[PDB]
Symmetry: C3
Subunit: 320 residues, 3 copies
């Protein structure tokens, strides 16, 4: 009585855990196309002077093709133009202010300084003095990102994701998009869960984080694609499950370099002088993470499960 029930329960553990099947890791390749533009009219303070930042930003202006299953979209920026190699006083900071030449030692390097000191204490503005350095001059300001993200419209951008997956051992290949589907759609958790077209603001709403806040100083968001794939015939299902998870740590600590931002350089020549424009770029990197398991009935696996089950059979008969 109880033994045929132990057998039916163990068989349930077979069918549910799909141990008659063999599991094979998935192979994924990703291709994304970003669509959308943003118009930028804003007022940014450079060196204590108000300035008007106005420009139209298209695809080539705020992104470049994905590498390593991840793409980036710039949302804010601080542009420092005209840097040329030379000597200049470092930007005023608690570390950089100097009372006299004794505070500056030639050759000193600081993790928060972009230049090597010359050992002299010189004026920056009025009577405030900082330590003179040798680097790209003038030094970029120690200034916060614009309070509204210059590319605030970034949440309205649209990312199109095409994912190809293969299982070599089972020799089975399929793609994220099935042929003949109505591509004109915006992904929704319930209305269009197979629609590959994503809107960034929708993504940030799913994970619960406000897009604008992350867009001011950048972040790392993650798009997850699950593939529970069954290859039997008696039952079949091998389609993706889109989830969204915010990857960045959200420390908000000046020591841990919070948000996502980097220093992009644009070199040129002017008046027979080598010059550089340093752009501090703030944006959200999207990591596309694909993980899948493919099961297909293996005779050896089913026989091994049977082998672990008939021992519980005999021993179960001994236990009663």
């Amino acid at each position: 009585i109880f033994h045929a029930l132990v057998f039916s329960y163990i068989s349930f553990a077979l069918i549910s855990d799909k141990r008659y099947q063999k599991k094979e890791p998935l192979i994924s390749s990703v291709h994304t196309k970003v669509k959308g533009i943003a118009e930028v009219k804003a007022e940014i303070l450079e060196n204590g002077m108000k300035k008007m930042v106005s420009g139209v930003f298209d695809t080539a202006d705020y992104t470049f093709p994905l590498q390593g299953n991840s793409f980036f979209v710039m949302t804010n920026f601080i542009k420092t133009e005209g840097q040329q190699q030379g000597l200049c006083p470092d930007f005023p900071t608690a570390r950089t202010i100097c009372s006299s030449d004794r505070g500056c030692k030639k050759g000193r390097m600081d993790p928060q300084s972009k230049g090597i000191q010359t050992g002299r204490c010189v004026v920056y503005k009025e009577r405030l003095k900082t330590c003179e350095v040798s680097a790209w001059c003038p030094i970029e300001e120690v200034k916060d990102a614009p309070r509204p993200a210059l590319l605030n419209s970034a949440e309205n951008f649209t990312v199109l994701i095409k994912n190809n997956i293969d299982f070599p051992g089972h020799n089975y290949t399929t793609r994220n998009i099935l042929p003949g589907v109505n591509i004109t759609c915006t992904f929704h958790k319930t209305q269009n869960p197979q629609c590959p077209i994503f809107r960034l603001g929708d993504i940030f709403q799913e994970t619960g984080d406000s897009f604008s806040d992350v867009a001011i100083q950048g972040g790392i968001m993650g798009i997850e694609i699950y593939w529970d794939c069954n290859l039997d015939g008696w039952f079949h299902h091998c389609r993706p499950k889109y989830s969204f998870r915010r990857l960045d740590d959200k420390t908000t600590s000046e020591s841990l370099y919070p948000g996502y931002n980097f220093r992009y350089a644009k070199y040129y020549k002017e008046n027979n002088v080598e010059k550089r424009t340093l752009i501090k770029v703030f944006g959200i990197r999207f990591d596309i993470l694909v993980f899948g398991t493919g099961g297909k009935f293996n005779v050896i696996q089913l026989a091994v499960y049977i082998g672990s089950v008939i021992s519980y059979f005999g021993l179960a008969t001994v236990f009663i």
Copy 2:
């Protein structure tokens, strides 16, 4: 009789499926060097005027170092020079043609338009009128890629692939290239299946897709490296198997952004005006996919297989 045969068959399932061994996922790192150049003499129509595109393209002109186990080779391009921020009529399309100002609404954005409308209907050429937009002017043409790919010689290029793999649990490391091998070789399915030097046209012949067709509008090809690795001593083999699979979907639908292409921007300054050159790049991205399993005799695994087998022993004795 039949029972010793069931034992020999189960032992065959052991030796064949290598269950006395433990399986460990592979760790891969890739390094590719692309060699080859292409001379380009062609005739391309810009704004209804015939032009001569002539130039020599070396490594730095059509590729950049691999990131994320994938490298790209440009094969075709459409170059739009002199773009500067301003107001211009959008390029004539079924969506962009306007009969009067009522058709243009200020601030409108279109997925196929690269600019924000100003709300005015202005002439583009002759009496044909399109909606005026605010963006990088003039707008790139809506034009097909050159009928012969400008970099048609791309199939003759040579990619050299060096792959390092490690198994941490077994502490075993090996590389794609064994020391002392004759590197001067071109990979062939039978003549040189271990030769790492690949020719792109050969790759496209293996997968059966014509190189030129894909090169006109770009594509995503995939190089697969298999590692069936055995670590025992009684038998040993741990070398790669090169296969080739075309990753792109080949939709050929204007709604799904077919082929592989992106918008690359080159910013400069001219006559004290901020200017931009937009190059639409068409090329084949090669994804190097490495997947391997490393087996090495584990006593616990063999004992567990024995444990599943002796139950089939006793129960098998009961079945007769």
Copy 3:
């Protein structure tokens, strides 16, 4: 007697190999921030003339953001300025020297040549003659990298690594850095093995390879992050293990393209002529490899182990 001992030993194989638990592959995302600068005063020979290379190199000058779980740091460079499309004699090499026009065939391409020949034998310097080619002129020298790496200070640079990992099946996420930790630290094998801050020279000392030697011609180093993660409650541990392994092959053979180096192009316009500056970049690419296994008690797994163990029970009783 011996049978209860076989049971205690098999139970030891259970607890040690953690087969009551289920193993799940790890999901990793990486974010690195490189800090440090380098001052460069050196003397490099261009075209047989001594020159002084002097410049200050910050983050934007020697690196760009990581893609595909790997970042690059330039350590040496050879800069060829002023290239424009045209005809020039190829640089003197055993392959390129020509006695007369019969040695040059028009349209010939060489794996070590950057241009297509025109079929004429012309002088390069004095009476030495090479084959005239059509390419970016003049051709970059066939010259060794500077004997001291121009960016020798690269070993003093600091890489900060933040790693996020997730197990979907168990729904458990954790990050490389625990909240509240003293970030100001330099990683040491024993003193600070959890400290994420790495120094490149320390990395190269751990693997035993001198930083400078690799920095002259570039290399591929690999940072490994292990995650042995236990999710039970009766015992718990899920933290990373940092190891370092040198990925490049160290062939030192001119045929196999040794070290890590690539050709980076900077296009500009001068005197109404399209021009290019070709920089041969030498540096160390760091591949961040994250691999982890997450175990959590699965009832079906423990029951399957029991099923393989009770058969060894009965059969063991038969063996005595």
